[PDB]
Amino acid sequence: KPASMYRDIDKPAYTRREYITGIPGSKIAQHKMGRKQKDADDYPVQISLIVEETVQLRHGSLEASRLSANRHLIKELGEEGDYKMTLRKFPHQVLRENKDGMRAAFGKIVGTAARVQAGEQLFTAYCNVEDAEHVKEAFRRAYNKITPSCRIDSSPAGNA
Amino acid sequence: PSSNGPLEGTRGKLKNKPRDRGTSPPQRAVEEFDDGEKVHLKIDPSVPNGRFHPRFDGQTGTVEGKQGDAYKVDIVDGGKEKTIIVTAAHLRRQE
Amino acid sequence: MHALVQLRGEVNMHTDIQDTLEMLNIHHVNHCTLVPETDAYRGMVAKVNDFVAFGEPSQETLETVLATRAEPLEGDADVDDEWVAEHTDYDDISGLAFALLSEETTLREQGLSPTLRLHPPRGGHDGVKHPVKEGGQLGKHDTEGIDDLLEAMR
Amino acid sequence: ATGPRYKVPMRRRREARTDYHQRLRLLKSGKPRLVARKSNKHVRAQLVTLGPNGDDTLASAHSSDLAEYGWEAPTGNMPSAYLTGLLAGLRAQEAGVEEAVLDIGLNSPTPGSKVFAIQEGAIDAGLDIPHNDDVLADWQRTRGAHIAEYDEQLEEPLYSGDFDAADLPEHFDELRETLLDGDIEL
Amino acid sequence: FHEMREPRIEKVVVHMGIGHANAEDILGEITGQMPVRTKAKRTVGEFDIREGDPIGAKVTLRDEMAEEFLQTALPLAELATSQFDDTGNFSFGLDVTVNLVRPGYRVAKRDKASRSIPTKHRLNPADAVAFIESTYDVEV
RNA sequence: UUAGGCGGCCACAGCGGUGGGGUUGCCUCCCGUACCCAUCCCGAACACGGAAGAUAAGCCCACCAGCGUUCCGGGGAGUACUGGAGUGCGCGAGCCUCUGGGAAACCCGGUUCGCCGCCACC
RNA sequence: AGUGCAAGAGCAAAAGAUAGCUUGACAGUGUUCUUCCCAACGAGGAACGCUGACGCGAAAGCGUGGUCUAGCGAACCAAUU
RNA sequence: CCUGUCAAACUCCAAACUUACAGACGCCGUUUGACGCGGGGAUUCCGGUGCGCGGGGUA
Ligand SMILES: [Cl-]
Ligand SMILES: [Cl-]
Ligand SMILES: [Mg+2]
Ligand SMILES: [Mg+2]
Ligand SMILES: [Mg+2]
Ligand SMILES: [Mg+2]
Ligand SMILES: [Mg+2]
Ligand SMILES: [Mg+2]
Ligand SMILES: [Mg+2]
Ligand SMILES: [Mg+2]
Ligand SMILES: [Mg+2]
Ligand code: NA
Ligand code: NA
Ligand code: NA
Ligand code: NA
Ligand code: NA
Ligand code: NA
Numbered sequence: 001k002p003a004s005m006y007r008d009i010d011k012p013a014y015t016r017r018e019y020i021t022g023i024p025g026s027k028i029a030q031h032k033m034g035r036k037q038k039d040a041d042d043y044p045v046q047i048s049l050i051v052e053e054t055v056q057l058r059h060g061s062l063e064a065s066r067l068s069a070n071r072h073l074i075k076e077l078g079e080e081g082d083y084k085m086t087l088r089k090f091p092h093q094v095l096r097e098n099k100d101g102m103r104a105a106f107g108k109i110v111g112t113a114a115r116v117q118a119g120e121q122l123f124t125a126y127c128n129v130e131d132a133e134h135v136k137e138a139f140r141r142a143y144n145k146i147t148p149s150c151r152i153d154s155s156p157a158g159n160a
Numbered sequence: 161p162s163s164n165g166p167l168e169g170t171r172g173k174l175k176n177k178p179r180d181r182g183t184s185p186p187q188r189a190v191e192e193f194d195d196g197e198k199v200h201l202k203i204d205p206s207v208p209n210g211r212f213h214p215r216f217d218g219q220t221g222t223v224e225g226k227q228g229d230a231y232k233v234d235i236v237d238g239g240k241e242k243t244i245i246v247t248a249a250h251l252r253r254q255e
Numbered sequence: 256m257h258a259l260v261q262l263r264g265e266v267n268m269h270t271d272i273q274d275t276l277e278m279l280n281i282h283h284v285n286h287c288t289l290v291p292e293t294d295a296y297r298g299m300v301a302k303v304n305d306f307v308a309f310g311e312p313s314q315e316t317l318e319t320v321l322a323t324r325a326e327p328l329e330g331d332a333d334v335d336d337e338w339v340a341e342h343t344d345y346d347d348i349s350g351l352a353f354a355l356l357s358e359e360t361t362l363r364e365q366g367l368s369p370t371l372r373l374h375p376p377r378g379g380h381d382g383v384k385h386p387v388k389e390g391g392q393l394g395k396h397d398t399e400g401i402d403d404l405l406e407a408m409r
Numbered sequence: 410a411t412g413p414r415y416k417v418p419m420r421r422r423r424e425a426r427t428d429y430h431q432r433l434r435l436l437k438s439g440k441p442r443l444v445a446r447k448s449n450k451h452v453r454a455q456l457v458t459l460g461p462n463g464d465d466t467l468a469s470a471h472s473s474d475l476a477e478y479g480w481e482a483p484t485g486n487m488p489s490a491y492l493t494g495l496l497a498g499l500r501a502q503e504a505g506v507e508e509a510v511l512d513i514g515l516n517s518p519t520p521g522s523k524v525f526a527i528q529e530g531a532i533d534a535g536l537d538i539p540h541n542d543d544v545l546a547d548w549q550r551t552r553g554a555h556i557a558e559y560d561e562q563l564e565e566p567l568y569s570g571d572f573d574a575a576d577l578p579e580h581f582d583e584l585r586e587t588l589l590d591g592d593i594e595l
Numbered sequence: 596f597h598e599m600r601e602p603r604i605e606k607v608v609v610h611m612g613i614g615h616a617n618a619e620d621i622l623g624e625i626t627g628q629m630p631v632r633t634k635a636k637r638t639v640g641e642f643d644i645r646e647g648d649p650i651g652a653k654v655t656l657r658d659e660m661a662e663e664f665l666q667t668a669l670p671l672a673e674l675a676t677s678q679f680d681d682t683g684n685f686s687f688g689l690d691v692t693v694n695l696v697r698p699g700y701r702v703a704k705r706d707k708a709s710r711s712i713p714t715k716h717r718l719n720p721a722d723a724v725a726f727i728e729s730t731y732d733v734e735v
Numbered sequence: 736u737u738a739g740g741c742g743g744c745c746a747c748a749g750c751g752g753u754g755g756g757g758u759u760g761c762c763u764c765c766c767g768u769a770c771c772c773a774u775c776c777c778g779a780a781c782a783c784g785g786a787a788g789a790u791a792a793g794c795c796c797a798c799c800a801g802c803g804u805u806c807c808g809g810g811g812a813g814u815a816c817u818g819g820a821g822u823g824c825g826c827g828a829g830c831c832u833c834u835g836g837g838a839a840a841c842c843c844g845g846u847u848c849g850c851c852g853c854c855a856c857c
Numbered sequence: 858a859g860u861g862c863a864a865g866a867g868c869a870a871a872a873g874a875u876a877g878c879u880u881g882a883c884a885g886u887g888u889u890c891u892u893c894c895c896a897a898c899g900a901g902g903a904a905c906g907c908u909g910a911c912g913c914g915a916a917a918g919c920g921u922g923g924u925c926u927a928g929c930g931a932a933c934c935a936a937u938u
Numbered sequence: 939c940c941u942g943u944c945a946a947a948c949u950c951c952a953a954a955c956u957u958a959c960a961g962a963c964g965c966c967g968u969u970u971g972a973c974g975c976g977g978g979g980a981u982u983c984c985g986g987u988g989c990g991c992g993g994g995g996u997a
Contacts, residue, residue, distance in 0.1 A: 001996080002996080009828085011993090011994090013945060016945060016948085086942070087942090088942055088943070090944075098995060098996085102994080106995090114943085114944095115944090163926090163927085166891070166902095166903080167866075170926085176867085179414065179416060179804095181868090182418075182869080185419065185429070185744080185745070186429060190436045200959085208872080211904075212889095212890070213890055213891065213904090215894060218957065220960085228906045228907085229437075232888085232905090236958090239895065246905090255960080272819080274965090275964090279965090280964090280965085291963090295963045298835090301834070301835055302819075304819070304820075304835080305833085386832085387833085391821085410750050410803060411802090413950045416746095417746045417749050420746090425709050431870090431917085434916090434918050437917065438916090448739085448763090450761085450786085455854070455855085457740095457853085459742090460743080460852070462852040463852040463853060464742045465741090465852085466740080466853055467854090469855060471740090471856085473855095485785080486783080486785090487771085512741090514707075515707045516781095517772085517781055518915050518916085519782055520771065522781095522783085522915095524915090525915070538916085539918095541915045544915045555769080555771070555784085556769095558770070559770065568785085598788075598791080600792085606779070628776060628777065629777085631775070631776045647875090657778090699764040699792045700779090700792085701779080702763085705779095705781095708763095708794080710793055712792065713793085715792090716792045
């Protein structure tokens with residue numbers, strides 16, 4: 001189903017699992033990638049992917065983009081390159097679908113999504129000044145798999 | 161409302177902030193008011209008896225005599241005059 | 256002491272906003288009233304802020320308007336120096352006006368209608384869809400801003 | 410103590426000095442409380458009323474200010490208790506106080522105990538206080554008969570300081586006699 | 596200072612935690628006063644479902660009654676370190692427990708203005724071993 | 736208040752900690768069970784009787800801020816949110832301007848180790 | 858923690874626990890709120906009195922069933938006091 | 939210890955705002971009698987739209 005059915009944040013926050021049952025599991029494989037044993041401060045360059053519009057990103061989307069990003073780094077820096085990227089958001093918002101007409105229309109649980117406020121950083125990578133262009137290219141691919149337009153903002157790094 | 165009992169929708173107003181928990185000081189449960197005195201009506205979450213219907217929490221009536229130990233306070237619900245049986249424990253002098 | 260001029264009609268305005276304008280003695284578009292600068296009054300004009308034009312007028316200006324648009328509590332009688340003198344606690348318009356701005360008295364206490372029914376602004380006004388800081392004619396004005404308006408509605 | 414949500418008992422409950430559930434039942438009579446308290450060497454009796462900022466003591470008596478009338482004996486026993494209550498009752502009567510309810514604080518309602526004694530004396534001073542005669546000690550034990558008969562099993566004076574040998578419950582009669590007189594300086 | 600600080604025996608409780616008694620007879624003779632039935636709480640699979648019901652007995656001794664029991668009880672045991680409480684108490688054995696504390700302990704046992712005893716004024720295993728050890732026997 | 740009793744507010748009073756204080760005064764601990772009374776067993780407690788001793792507890796006095804709490808400064812912040820108005824912007828979601836209000840977290844620095852009432856009392 | 862049962866709420870020298878005693882889960886008649894916000898409407902419910910008779914307690918006092926909000930039924934007719 | 943996120947049926951916090959009563963100003967009433975009381979007569983109990991806040995629903 002299209003994200004057009006879920007990308008907006010207008011329904012109430014629906015997260016209380018003590019009242020919701022049958023919630024599908026998340027497809028997000030992992031939130032922390034690269035060398036997770038190392039610290040983010042051990043890196044001179046910090047680049048984040050900032051969402052420009054407030055929206056809801058379905059878990060299949062977070063995974064689809066997270067994957068296509070890290071996969072690029074792995075390919076450019078090796079399965080053990082010196083970097084660490086983080087998907088900081090989690091899909092707490094439960095999604096329904098009314099699948100009778102509008103009678104007893106409260107939908108059934110079909111998925112989950114993360115609510116991101118515009119300006120927030122969805123992804124954050126940490127690398128060495130040399131790999132900065134790869135991490136930028138990884139993000140250029142990641143934002144092509146989520147609803148909003150984004151900014152690839154570089155934080156610690158005045159090595160231009 | 162899914163039901164229409166008296167304590168419906170009172171979760172907030174009839175509950176105490178954790179710190180005000182426990183038995184209340186006796187001083188105000190024994191206060192004496194004189195006919196004509198304006199008093200504020202607020203149920204004390206810790207005192208079971210002498211209460212009035214929650215809807216009236218917030219009203220400011222006028223004492224007009226008593227009944228037993230409880231006081232009879234006159235109030236105006238919207239445009240309707242009502243007399244409320246309530247003990248001092250749930251009353252404070254206006255001003 | 257501020258001069259209040261209603262610039263937007265009643266149709267669609269909140270009832271509680273209309274009721275205020277009424278308590279301030281204004282019941283028609285282009286009607287003006289002189290209000291003291293007190294806490295109670297400030298609350299009122301703040302509430303009317305989007306349908307009115309207010310500000311402190313200069314002594315002269317007030318005079319021009321009192322001459323031109325003031326009226327007795329009843330009747331046509333032109334409120335001029337002579338009228339002022341024979342009916343008020345002052346000698347002439349300037350005297351009355353000074354008392355109004357200094358907030359020592361009101362148009363009622365002197366037997367005058369609380370409302371100055373002005374004339375449409377000659378040359379037009381700056382629009383009733385925007386405030387003064389945006390080129391509109393709504394909201395608070397400069398003493399010079401208010402005067403230009405009052406004078407055009409002379 | 411632990412966090413913002415932690416509940417701290419009222420000060421006088423922390424100090425384990427006031428039973429508030431009882432204080433409430435007590436204040437309900439709308440009368441003045443006849444506060445009867447004890448000490449190892451002394452016994453106190455106060456007549457308290459409610460006040461805007463705290464209780465008001467209208468009249469009181471302490472076993473120590475008993476000697477001021479002749480009492481040459483110890484001050485932490487039944488005869489001492491009765492008398493201290495009587496004196497307070499008299500001062501109370503003087504102050505314009507007529508009725509009262511017995512507040513024995515954290516003490517136990519044990520029959521014949523000293524608080525009840527404090528209550529009897531106070532009652533005898535002409536003060537109206539809800540009571541129960543058969544919860545009071547028998548006249549003699551009030552006089553101090555039990556102590557004399559204990560000194561009887563002597564072999565060693567029950568009293569160190571020199572105040573009689575076989576003791577004198579009479580001194581009690583003599584002191585009560587004194588208080589009951591209408592010339593005494595209250 | 597020392598006097599109102601030197602240890603003393605408050606009570607020696609002797610009990611038998613059977614499970615359903617006929618043993619009360621021995622505790623009475625071994626101590627010098629009546630025992631006390633011991634009910635249990637919660638239901639147990641060990642056919643011990645009955646909430647309130649005889650399961651054990653105990654005797655709380657104070658003063659001489661307590662010493663005169665120790666002048667024979669203690670001997671029948673080999674006191675050790677680990678066997679000591681943090682407050683300076685200890686239990687050996689038929690159970691025999693000995694409660695040790697300093698003078699004004701009534702402060703925390705009375706009704707009026709009661710108060711818990713300041714740790715500084717609380718007893719210690721060391722000070723405990725000492726006190727007792729200094730009375731017809733050896734430590735560890 | 737050279738140590739007490741009854742309270743009000745009910746943590747600004749809690750938690751933890753340091754120093755000081757009592758020969759016939761006070762409170763205690765303390766000493767002791769013939770009695771009133773008492774322990775489903777224990778004068779432990781409760782109750783009663785009492786001063787040989789003590790200031791080690793408690794308590795009272797002086798003080799410490801590490802934790803908890805109260806209030807204040809500076810910063811976060813006139814940010815977030817928001818009552819009134821708009822032929823302002825935006826495909827839209829939504830945003831902006833004017834007017835009237837206005838946080839929360841957190842950081843840094845102060846404050847807080849109770850205040851007050853009645854009574855009795857070298 | 859416990860407090861019979863939803864959920865939310867109340868409670869610590871207790872509203873919980875243990876023990877003991879007791880039948881106020883009493884008769885009669887009301888005031889007030891609720892049912893039905895405002896704003897009329899029955900049964901039902903509750904709060905709070907009084908009269909009478911009682912229980913417990915030293916006493917103040919508490920007991921108009923269960924800590925609070927669900928557990929309820931007209932006229933006609935029958936049986937019953 | 940450090941590090942990454944949330945809540946219609948969470949809350950150590952906490953608005954704007956709504957709301958009881960009272961005072962003040964304003965406006966109103968005392969020949970236009972308000973506020974209130976008693977009585978006669980209704981109509982009405984298919985509503986719709988914009989804006990703000992919503993709940994459901996891909997819409
Ligand atoms: Cl009510
Ligand atoms: Cl006492
Ligand atoms: Mg709510
Ligand atoms: Mg006219
Ligand atoms: Mg023209
Ligand atoms: Mg125009
Ligand atoms: Mg010392
Ligand atoms: Mg009840
Ligand atoms: Mg039929
Ligand atoms: Mg029948
Ligand atoms: Mg509302
Ligand atoms: Na169907
Ligand atoms: Na995109
Ligand atoms: Na409370
Ligand atoms: Na038994
Ligand atoms: Na001391
Ligand atoms: Na009814």
